[PDB]
Amino acid sequence: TTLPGWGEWAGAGSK
Amino acid sequence: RSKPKELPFFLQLSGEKVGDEASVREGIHRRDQE
Amino acid sequence: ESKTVVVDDQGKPRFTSAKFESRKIMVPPHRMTPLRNSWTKIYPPLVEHLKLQVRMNLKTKSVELRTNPKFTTDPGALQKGADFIKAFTLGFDLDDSIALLRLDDLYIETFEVKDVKTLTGDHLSRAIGRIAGKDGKTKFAIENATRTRIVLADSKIHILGGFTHIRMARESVVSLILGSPPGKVYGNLRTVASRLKER
Amino acid sequence: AVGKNKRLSKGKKGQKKRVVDPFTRKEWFDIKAPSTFENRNVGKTLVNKSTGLKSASDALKGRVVEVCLADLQGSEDHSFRKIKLRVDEVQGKNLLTNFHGMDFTTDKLRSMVRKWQTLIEANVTVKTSDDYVLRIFAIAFTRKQANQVKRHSYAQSSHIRAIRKVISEILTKEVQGSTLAQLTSKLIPEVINKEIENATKDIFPLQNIHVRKVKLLKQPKFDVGALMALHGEEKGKKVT
Amino acid sequence: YKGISLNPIYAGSSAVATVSENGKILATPVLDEINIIDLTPGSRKILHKISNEDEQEITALKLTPDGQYLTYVSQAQLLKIFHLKTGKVVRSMKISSPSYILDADSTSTLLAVGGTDGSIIVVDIENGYITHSFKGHGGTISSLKFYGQLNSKIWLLASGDTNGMVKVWDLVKRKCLHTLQEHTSAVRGLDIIEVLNLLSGGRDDIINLWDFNMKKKCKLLKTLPVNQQVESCGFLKDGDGKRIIYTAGGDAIFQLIDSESGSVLKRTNKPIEELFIIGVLPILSNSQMFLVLSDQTLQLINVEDTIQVTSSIAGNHGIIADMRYVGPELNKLALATNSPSLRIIPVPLPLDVEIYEGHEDLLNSLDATEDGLWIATASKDNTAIVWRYNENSCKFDIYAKYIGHSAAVTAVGLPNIVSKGYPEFLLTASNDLTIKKWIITRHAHEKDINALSVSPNDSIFATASYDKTCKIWNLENGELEATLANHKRGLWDVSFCQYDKLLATSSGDKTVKIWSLDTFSVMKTLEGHTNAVQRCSFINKQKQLISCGADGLIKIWDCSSGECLKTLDGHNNRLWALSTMNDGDMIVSADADGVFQFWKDCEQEIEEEQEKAKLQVEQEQSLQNYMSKGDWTNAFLLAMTLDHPMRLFNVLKRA
Amino acid sequence: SQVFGVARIYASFNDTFVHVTDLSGKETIARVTGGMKVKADRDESSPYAAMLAAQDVAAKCKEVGITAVHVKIRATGGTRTKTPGPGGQAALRALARSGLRIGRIEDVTPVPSDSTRKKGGRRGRRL
């Protein structure tokens, strides 16, 4: 249930 | 007489199919087949 | 590049040849609950087809979208994603907000019952029951006719779709608010659906 | 509409030729905030001409600009915040500016508005030690407890009036103890609403305690030296 | 009807036209096209207009000191370089920054563009590849300057920042040689003078001069003030010792000043026009200058405390209130425009204008004498000045002047002048009801007064207005004779029929009413228009009465008919100025646009109809006599020319 | 670095005002109208009008040399609606595609706390 989004910047460039 | 017989994400619609009759009144694939 | 002039004929010289942008959008918690519930299918249309950096501060109850200059050179995409999240947060469904992303001529209009004709209490209640119809049947009829999508809040009424489509839906729902009987509404409905199907 | 079927009226019987050259006769002038802010260098304004230095001066003194604290101090947390200033003095394409008023943004106010709580507002009227007459609008919400089983969080009007009186006391005391630039420095790191929170901590659990708005009502006499001091002399170039 | 259209030359976009070293050439931007004209003494003609796109407008254009290329940037951030010989575009490429200043060398090999972002580029002309790109200052550039020697190995590049700094670069080293921060405003004018020394015009007050070397040796030579905002500046060799400095500055003042002393040496004129000189196109060899001026005008200047201007040309007659015919020869045209000067044009290609500034406000109205030499121009200023023109060498005399009332004289009218040419009286009409008659005074129209009409026998006077009423009165007194008292929504124009002795009223709606001067009644009503006639005119034949039309058209009917005879649709938008030459009955029409058209009927169409019918008769009889005799070859030729298949097939049968 | 503008966009129900001003709202840079953009009387509230208007005022803004801009929409407000229009959304999309550096978007619509009676009546205003 690891969610990119709420945690940090979820994008095509980096994380 | 013998030869046998036999989607985009960002869609593209125009101002009549969509409701832009303003642009309609101000109105202004065979290559891919080749 | 080294530097040297070549004097051509007629003395002519001769040489040889040699930003992010972001947007923030709030979300109410009653809209944040299905946002958290179905967050998984929200970003795949945008981060893949629009290449837009996403973050979501649950500390601030907001979502941030950043265009990278090298990863993305597309002017209206951040704006389109802003419209997408605006439609969803205003209360529209995921697929129709994605439809707004697919098109660019999808437009929203909201308005209020007190803006059209102020009513009070149980009058407002009976009016909301009228404009809803039995189990949203009338709302479905309007949506199918005008090819529009409707969101019915307490007083805020939101209508997504084409310009003249939401115009026609607006005239119809103004009639409902003013007190039109649903039979004559259906008559005008199949009339306008007849001309819209003929076009 | 300017169509060929647009029915003519009186209207454009006699018009003119576009020869005013406004963007060549105009002149850019960089305004600059007092020293209480990080990025004082923010925004350039256009003076209509240059032959009237008198017109330049009165126009720039009548300028009332507005900015946000987010872009002012680099911390975009204060995006909802917004202030108005006004250029008080000019110096050779550089314009001294001074504070004028404050507000939030409407979307912030709307989001803070909820349905199962009570909003309290305090509207005090005060004059600083700097003799600036001011009107202060502040707001707060009736939050609920962690143990709250109730859907709503509503309190008694006795609590409302008591907390109102407490708030207005706090504002009057702090402003009368403060000066203008001192009030701005107090205004920056939201410490006053925290003070009110710790004061009202015994009465009721509250939330979203925020000064909504600031209204300058009167300003005292002019002091260019004081303005130069709070902002932070010049020779010429020997033209011949 | 035959129709001759004249078009605006320098119209729309604010981009300075360019010429070569020879004066027989120019190229103007209209709103989307660059029309190129060969400019010969006399034989001034047009080569071709280029019509890339009507959406974008030309941001800038450049014509090299030889008539070889045209380099122009449109609204999109892209240049198009154009071959002048072939009349075709050579190349086009984008620049990612809206360019505004284009500097070509004297030699036709190198050009430079610079815009708003701060970065400029130098590009080769014969091959459109960027030679090198300068990042430049962090400000919007305002001017460029080269240093072009034909046989050398060093070229210079001075930029005019919006800030008060010039960056002189090297080009064969591609290095910023010096950065001189002296101005406080944008450097509008630039000049590089031979030893080095340098000149730089900053728009605030300043004309800086710099002693200079390729090495670090650069200081302020001097600095010069001018009593205006300088738009462009440079040197002139006239006065070889005191190398004079020419300065085209904002108030349309082109000064010649000294280098050694700050005193002026030669000014041009103090124009009553408050017009910005948008630049100078020098020649520097022919001692000729082209003062281009923001009223879309050019001034030929010869250089040796006022300058006698060599010549004046217009590139636009944009909005025209009224047309009049000037001269007993009737060749000049009086142009009542929205400009504080009566414009005289000739009837015929670029036509030079003759501007007469009598007042400071625009020409509200106009009238003239049928016998030439007397004019009457009324301003939006409260003046109504009555003029002698003389049919000899072109003098304009404004000796007659009416202070009038204290309001904008919207109309002036004169019935007849005495044989002495002594004006008897004028009728002046205003926006309000301060209407009067002034010798060398009534109150009737609640609404604004719209039109005058002169009785050619110096008898009566009829006036239309917005309150649906026209007034007819005796000319000598102020006693009112009668009132036409009625319409739907107003009246725009009145006109007296002298050979027919009637009255015509373009109303406020789409119709016109013909009134008998006897019954004071509606003699006729004419419909058929859409929005607004605004001009009912009598033809010289006094039968085919004309109405112009604010939809943009012309419609004509016989006065006895009542049915619209013909309709012309040359203009696009509106139609405001309408006149008619009588001797050659020629209808002349001008819309709100700068476009114009002549019109004239010809009965040669009827003559040719008679002739073709005659020819048909003759060859028909020839064919019939051939059907009698034989000669089936000629008979078949005639049958093919006649399309008579039966007789043709008969010819085939006999054959 | 950049220089900012004030893109006040009135989203009227049957009109669109796209006015840009300088700092303090005094130096009025540009101003345009939907019907003037598209010369029709139905289309004075057209998204196409908004598109052409935003393109033209962006041309003027890049002409004067303003690169970045904070944009402030404003609806009708008053006793009327206070929600801006699809013309406003269209203009916003068109200026974002014009590419002037958007610093911040605002919705400053004049909202009555407690207003007067509208021109509607006892049965309703429209239709």
Curated annotation (Swiss-Prot), chain A:
Subcellular location(s) of the protein: Nucleus, Nucleolus
Tree of life domain: Eukaryota
Subunit structure and binding partners: Interacts with snoRNA U3. Interacts with MPP10. Component of the ribosomal small subunit (SSU) processome composed of at least 40 protein subunits and snoRNA U3.
Record function comment: Involved in nucleolar processing of pre-18S ribosomal RNA.
Any further remark recorded for this protein: Present with 1470 molecules/cell in log phase SD medium.
Similarity comment: family membership: Belongs to the UTP14 family.
Name used for this protein in its record: U3 small nucleolar RNA-associated protein 14
Species, as recorded: Saccharomyces cerevisiae (strain ATCC 204508 / S288c)
Covered range of the whole protein: 786 to 800 of 899
Swiss-Prot record, chain C:
Taxonomic superkingdom: Eukaryota
Keywords from the named record: Cytoplasm, Nucleus, Phosphoprotein, Ribosome biogenesis, RNA-binding
GO cellular component, one term: nucleus
GO molecular function: rRNA primary transcript binding; unfolded protein binding
Localization in the cell: Cytoplasm; Nucleus, Nucleolus
Predominant subcellular localization, coarse grouping: cytoplasm
Ranges in a coiled coil: none
UniProt family annotation: Belongs to the PNO1 family.
Function: Required for small ribosomal subunit (SSU) synthesis. Has a role in the processing of early nucleolar and late cytoplasmic pre-RNA species. Recruits DIM1 to nucleolar pre-RNAs. Indirectly required for cleavage at the A2 site of the 20S pre-rRNA, forming 18S rRNA, and at A1 and A2 sites of other pre-rRNAs.
Oligomeric form and interacting partners: Component of the small ribosomal subunit, ribosomal RNA processing complex (SSU RRP complex). Interacts with NOB1.
Protein name: Pre-rRNA-processing protein PNO1
Organism in which the protein naturally occurs: Saccharomyces cerevisiae (strain ATCC 204508 / S288c) (Baker's yeast)
UniProtKB/Swiss-Prot annotation, chain E:
Keywords assigned by UniProt, alphabetized: Nucleus, Repeat, Ribonucleoprotein, Ribosome biogenesis, rRNA processing, WD repeat
Keyword Lyase: no
GO BP of this protein: endonucleolytic cleavage in 5'-ETS of tricistronic rRNA transcript (SSU-rRNA, 5.8S rRNA, LSU-rRNA); endonucleolytic cleavage in ITS1 to separate SSU-rRNA from 5.8S rRNA and LSU-rRNA from tricistronic rRNA transcript (SSU-rRNA, 5.8S rRNA, LSU-rRNA); endonucleolytic cleavage to generate mature 5'-end of SSU-rRNA from (SSU-rRNA, 5.8S rRNA, LSU-rRNA); maturation of SSU-rRNA; maturation of SSU-rRNA from tricistronic rRNA transcript (SSU-rRNA, 5.8S rRNA, LSU-rRNA)
GO function terms (MF aspect): U3 snoRNA binding
CDD domains: WD40 (cd00200)
Ranges: WD repeats: 53-94, 96-133, 136-181, 185-220, 225-267, 358-397, 404-440, 444-483, 486-527, 528-569, 571-608, 618-655
Chief place where the protein resides: nucleus
Signal peptide location: none
PANTHER family per the UniProt record, alphabetical: TRANSDUCIN BETA-LIKE 3, TRANSDUCIN BETA-LIKE PROTEIN 3
Protein name, per record: U3 small nucleolar RNA-associated protein 13
Organism: Saccharomyces cerevisiae (strain ATCC 204508 / S288c)
Swiss-Prot record, chain F:
Subunit-level organization: Component of the small ribosomal subunit (SSU). Mature yeast ribosomes consist of a small (40S) and a large (60S) subunit. The 40S small subunit contains 1 molecule of ribosomal RNA (18S rRNA) and 33 different proteins (encoded by 57 genes). The large 60S subunit contains 3 rRNA molecules (25S, 5.8S and 5S rRNA) and 46 different proteins (encoded by 81 genes). uS11 interacts with eS1 forming part of the mRNA exit tunnel. uS11 interacts with snoRNA U3. uS11 interacts with MPP10. Component of the ribosomal small subunit (SSU) processome composed of at least 40 protein subunits and snoRNA U3.
Keyword annotations of the record: Acetylation, Cytoplasm, Nucleus, Ribonucleoprotein, Ribosomal protein, Ribosome biogenesis, rRNA processing
A Pfam family: Ribosomal_S11
Family, as annotated: Belongs to the universal ribosomal protein uS11 family.
Primary localization class, coarse: cytoplasm
Organism ancestry: Eukaryota, Fungi, Dikarya, Ascomycota, Saccharomycotina
Protein name: Small ribosomal subunit protein uS11A
UniProt xrefs under NCBIfam families: PRK09607.1
Paired cysteines (S-S): none
Single Gene Ontology MF annotation: mRNA binding
Localisation per UniProt entry: Cytoplasm; Nucleus, Nucleolus
Anything else known: Present with 29600 molecules/cell in log phase SD medium.
Record has Acetylation as a keyword: yes
PTM remark: N-terminally acetylated by acetyltransferase NatA.
Amino acid composition bias (Basic residues), ranges on this chain: 118-127
Region Disordered: start-end pairs: 107-127
Signal peptide bounds: none
Gene Ontology CC annotation, any one: nucleoplasm
